């Protein structure tokens, strides 16, 4: 039982790490999109304020 349990824990941790890696990839893509969008939004606010004087 202990041998099989340790094998299963190794497999489960490997799969969990793989899933966390896929989720990290997706969230990194989302974070980059959001960061660029925030830069653009702040810059457009500044531009509109400057041109609206």
């Amino acid at each position: 039982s202990t041998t099989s349990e340790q094998s299963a824990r190794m497999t489960a941790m490997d799969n969990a790490s793989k899933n966390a890696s896929e989720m990290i990839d997706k969230l990194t893509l989302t974070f980059n999109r959001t960061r660029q969008a925030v830069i653009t939004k702040e810059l457009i606010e500044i531009i509109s304020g400057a041109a609206a004087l």
């Binding site: 606010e45 500044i46 304020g49 400057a50 004087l53």
Partner: protein, 469 residues
């Protein structure tokens, strides 16, 4: 000199002068108002026009209304006669008690002390609050900050400090409420009257109040800080004595500056802030200093919009402070009050050569154990507490005991908790934390340490918990 309103847009009034113009920062008085409306000059636009920010509501102003030029910046009454009173930005009293009868009027705009006036001495100011005294000890004559979002304990903490330091402080004191709820202003007025620092009968008042609450137009909020600062400066120099100066919040000064910048023709900066944020804040925070002629202990509450410590306003304010106590919402949710963040607070005097090696080592041990606890919390989210090394569980237990032991009941938070306020002398706090780290209490349960004063009270609370078990 006499001029003539030519435009009114929001809180910004454009006034035209046929004679010589008035210099920037001068106060002008609008003629034809039932109350007193004071405009302050902010720009010269050419063609004899001057732009100004109104220190009051600009309702009922008519294009053409005559304006008088006082010839000097806003001059407030200063002296021992302002103690126990309340004031506007423009210095007129709002306590419904009669005129302030002083011989000295001080202009609210002045140059900051020069570099050849700075005091370089620091000695701990014991406030009686465990977390503050241990991890971010204050200092006489130094500027203190209380960062944190909304609903974390800024006002309660500042009221607690007034309760402790101001009550037993020989020198005078000043409270400038900048852009805060008027309910709180009234509550403070009545609490001070009850305590006795404000005496309505004799001339023994020890506190002077200035109020610019959040119903005022931006012009008044941007200047009430300077009014309170002027009162404090006079008490520093002429009286030649120690002063305290509490401000709540010093973020409303910045914000009020931001509400008129766009109408004064300035392009905005990083996040809808005026281009002159840092300069405007510096020209004020640089007069709140302990020169060699006096000594101002300045406590400032600083709103952090949306808990974002990287916002330009708090981010800039960080550089003007000796000590900071960053109240944190994530710790106030846990019920640890005051919610001071032990890892995000700092002090200048926190060196082994100013406080001592025992105090310094205890503080650093506490901070290290809390950081290790934070590192472990990530693992506990996957393993569970049952699977930690029997040494790690010891770290977690010590960390939780230390986390609870930093909580303390205030004498002003009786209404919320219902408990009784405790003042913990510095030696007792050092002893308590040194013992908790050394392991002399690794058998008492965690909750014994929650909301108690010195460590012996934790022992007694644990004894009571055991007896009624």
């Amino acid at each position: 000199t006499t001029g003539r309103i030519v435009a009114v847009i929001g809180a910004v009034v454009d006034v035209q002068f046929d004679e010589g113009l008035p210099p920037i920062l001068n106060a002008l008085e609008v003629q034809g108002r039932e109350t007193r409306l004071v405009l302050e000059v902010a720009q010269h636009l050419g063609e004899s026009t001057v732009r100004t920010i109104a220190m009051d509501g600009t309702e009922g102003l008519v294009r053409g209304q005559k304006v008088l030029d006082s010839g000097a910046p806003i001059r407030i009454p200063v002296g021992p006669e302002t103690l126990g009173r309340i004031m506007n930005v423009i210095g007129e009293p709002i306590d419904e008690r009669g005129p302030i009868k002083t011989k000295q009027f001080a202009a609210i705009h002045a140059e900051a002390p020069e570099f050849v006036e700075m005091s370089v001495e620091q000695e701990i100011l014991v406030t009686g609050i465990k977390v503050v005294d241990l991890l971010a000890p204050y200092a006489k004559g130094g500027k203190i900050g209380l960062f944190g979002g909304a609903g974390v304990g800024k006002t309660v903490l500042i009221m607690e400090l007034i309760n402790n330091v101001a009550k037993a402080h020989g020198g005078y004191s000043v409270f400038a409420g900048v852009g805060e709820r008027t309910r709180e202003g009234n509550d403070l007025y009545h609490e001070m009257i009850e305590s006795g620092v404000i005496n309505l009968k004799d001339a023994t008042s020890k506190v002077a109040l200035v109020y610019g609450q959040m119903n005022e137009p931006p012009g008044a909020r941007a200047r009430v800080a300077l009014t309170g600062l002027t009162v404090a400066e006079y008490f520093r120099d002429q009286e030649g004595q120690d002063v305290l100066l509490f401000i709540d919040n010093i973020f409303r000064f910045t914000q009020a500056g931001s509400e008129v910048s766009a109408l004064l023709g300035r392009i905005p900066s990083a996040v809808g802030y005026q281009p002159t944020l840092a300069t405007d804040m510096g020209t004020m925070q640089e007069r709140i200093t302990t020169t060699k002629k006096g000594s101002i202990t300045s406590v400032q509450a600083i709103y952090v919009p949306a808990d974002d410590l990287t916002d330009p306003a708090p981010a800039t304010t960080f550089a003007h402070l000796d000590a900071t106590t960053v109240l944190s919402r994530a710790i106030a949710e846990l019920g640890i009050y005051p919610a001071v963040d032990p890892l995000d607070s700092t002090s200048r005097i926190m060196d082994p050569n100013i406080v001592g090696s025992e105090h310094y080592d205890v503080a650093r041990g506490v901070q290290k154990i809390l950081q290790d606890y934070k590192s472990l919390q990530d693992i506990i989210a996957i393993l569970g507490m049952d699977e930690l090394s029997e040494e790690d569980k010891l770290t977690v237990s010590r960390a939780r005991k230390i986390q609870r032991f930093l909580s303390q009941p205030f004498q002003v938070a009786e209404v919320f908790t219902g408990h009784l306020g405790k003042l913990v002398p510095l030696k007792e706090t050092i002893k308590g934390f040194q013992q908790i780290l050394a392991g002399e209490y690794d058998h008492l349960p965690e909750q014994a340490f929650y909301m108690v004063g010195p460590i012996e009270e934790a022992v007694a609370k644990a004894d009571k918990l055991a007896e009624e078990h």
